[PDB]
Chains A and B, each alone.
Chain A
Amino acid sequence: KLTRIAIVNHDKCKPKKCRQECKKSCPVVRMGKLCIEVTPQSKIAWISETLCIGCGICIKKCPFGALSIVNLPSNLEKETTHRYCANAFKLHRLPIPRPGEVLGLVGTNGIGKSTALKILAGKQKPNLGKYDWQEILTYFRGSELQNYFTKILEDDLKAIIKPQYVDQIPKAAKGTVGSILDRKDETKTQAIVCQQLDLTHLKERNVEDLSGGELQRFACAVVCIQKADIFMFDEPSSYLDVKQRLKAAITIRSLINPDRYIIVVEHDLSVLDYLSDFICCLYGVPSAYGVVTMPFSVREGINIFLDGYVPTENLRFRDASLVFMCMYKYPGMKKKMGEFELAIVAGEFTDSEIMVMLGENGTGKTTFIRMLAGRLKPDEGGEVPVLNVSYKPQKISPKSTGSVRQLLHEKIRDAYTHPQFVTDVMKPLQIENIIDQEVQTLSGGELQRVALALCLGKPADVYLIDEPSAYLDSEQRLMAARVVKRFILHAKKTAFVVEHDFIMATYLADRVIVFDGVPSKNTVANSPQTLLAGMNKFLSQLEITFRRDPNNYRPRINKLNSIKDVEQKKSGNYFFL
């Protein structure tokens, strides 16, 4: 029981430049059949996946890499919930949103996640692989889906989407933060939401002046204000800091009424865990097809995701299960602005080391990073190391019109060719697939992959890494983490990682530097502590504890004054290992 799916990448497939091609090389067409239809004219090539052998010839011939042929199980053909065009993506099933329960979708991008969100919003009618509302409702019977859609169709439920792409919001709306919130009032609960998400300082400022983390807080606060059912949340944690992303989770959990459906989408697994009560995985071949699993528990669903093995379907979807000398010395530097007093403790910086930076969005991780670089100048003291440095920023725009190939050779030709770099950075971050695309038409994750590659390739002693996990898929995150580790192990060049994810921080950390104190006030940057002690200080400052599920040892988040939390605080082991 196996069938095939043809896919034609409509951006890449240009029938005029290439000529007919496919037809000439296809053995079904050379026989004399309607396997492929093209001509020099017309846009996009069509393939009959019925008549198609799946010889894998047409893909090798086509000059752009426009064609793909994948193999999907024949079980899925019955349970197709959407297909937009012929030779395009094929979504199977939909997640099962439950009223008064936060749905947690988990799964990598390009697996029909966006189309599902649109369907559940009610923008997209499920064409059901036909390319109807009574027919659609009959298809969805015996399940809460028919309940959901019936609710949508007569009682006009308001679909609201916290978007993925946050940097496009500034270039659309205008005025202050406080003004937009005042305009969008329906519940009339500005103050409480602002105290939860800390928008007391930010109310005065404009939208363009905000950082990434503050923009997220703003966008979530806006969605919380709007009176609506069916809340779609797409990566709220990305750009945020540890305590900010927990507060954002708490706010979203507070939005639960028995009326409202909520559908979060998190890639930080500990945050997703905290958010949801109900989870649905999204496995498939990226860009070709996608399957929405049956709804598991929070715990069970994420274990299934880590195993890469759905026990009920019995489909091992992923191959592998994703489970868990001194260079220089800075002295006691102090940098007083006038009202604000930034401080440093003395310590070492051993080569082949990744220093993780624990703190907050405001404690001035970015400002310290700029100071270390030379991009910021000293008020007092004077950090002027005779050292080349590289700087992966938070906010990543594509304002350099061309191809990724051009970007790579313009910045760094040697690294771009070098095999040790290529095995370490290009291949694992699937840069071989991005290479041909334009820089304008990147996604957010793809831009983050390119950023990682650009800064690793540029030679230095220090490598600054602000938010590598931002936008990347949980798999990609863990790859990006491995890439940074190995690159540094080969190079013997130190790095510094601003992360707000306890999965990635525990993964990367050899030594860990901690920041203390509130932002825009006195920052006491401690000496590089060992990992064991370092996280415990950081967790004690933010008042969180974790634990580990014996199957995959994944860090789960605790409740305040829960017995397990209290025990861990008394011991001093705020998490494990």
Chain B
Amino acid sequence: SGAKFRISLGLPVGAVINCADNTGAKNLYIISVKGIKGRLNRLPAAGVGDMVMATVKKGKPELRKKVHPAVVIRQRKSYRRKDGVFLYFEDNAGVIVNNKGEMKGSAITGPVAKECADLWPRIASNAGSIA
């Protein structure tokens, strides 16, 4: 019911956020952001809690050389919360996921941003620490 609010998004298409679930993927090369109409010359960009088509660039060869949906979970670009606190995350990160929002992994290392957890319940359940 409660919608997302925009947040400063510092993962343009080309970024390698590190995979932070137990799949076996190390990296996640972001090849496109989901739900972006866009403009001329503007790279699509995903903040925390965004859906994103990624490719795994290093990790298990089951995962390599194919596209996955994923969710950005942490991000180093500082976003503002409605309560006026800016917040940033030390690393960019994500998790491999399926179209309907379920994790294909099982346990999320490190914290998940609450912008993402509120939006993605199955990620939030596996997430040890939030924000």
Contacts and interface: CB of A to CB of B under 8 A. Distances in A.
Contacts of A551: 121, 124-125
Interface of A: 550-551
Interface residues of B, number: 3
Contacts of A550: 124
A550 B125 CA distance: 9
4 contacts: A550-B124, A551-B121, A551-B124, A551-B125
Nearest to A552: B121
Contacts of B125: 551
Nearest to A303: B125
Contacts, number: 4
B131 to A, nearest CB: 13
A174 to B, nearest CB: 55
A577 to B, nearest CB: 11
Contacts of B124: 550-551
Interface string B29-64: 000000000000000000000000000000000000
Contacts of B121: 551
A550 B127 CA distance: 12
A142 B121 CA distance: 36
Closest 4 CB pairs of A and B: A551-B125, A551-B121, A550-B124, A551-B124
A551 B130 CA distance: 14
Interface string B104-126: 00000000000000000100110
A551 B125 CA distance: 7
Nearest to B106: A311
Interface in B4-34: none
B21 to A, nearest CB: 16
A551 B123 CA distance: 11
Nearest to A323: B121
B22 to A, nearest CB: 15
B59 to A, nearest CB: 24
A551 B126 CA distance: 11
A550 B117 CA distance: 10
A551 B121 CA distance: 7
A559 B24 CA distance: 43
A550 B121 CA distance: 9
B92 to A, nearest CB: 25
Nearest to A551: B125
Nearest to A550: B124
B129 to A, nearest CB: 13
Nearest to A321: B121
B105 to A, nearest CB: 13
A576 to B, nearest CB: 14
A551 B124 CA distance: 8
A530 B125 CA distance: 33
A320 to B, nearest CB: 13
Interface in B73-130: 121, 124-125
B34 to A, nearest CB: 23
A550 B126 CA distance: 12
B66 to A, nearest CB: 23
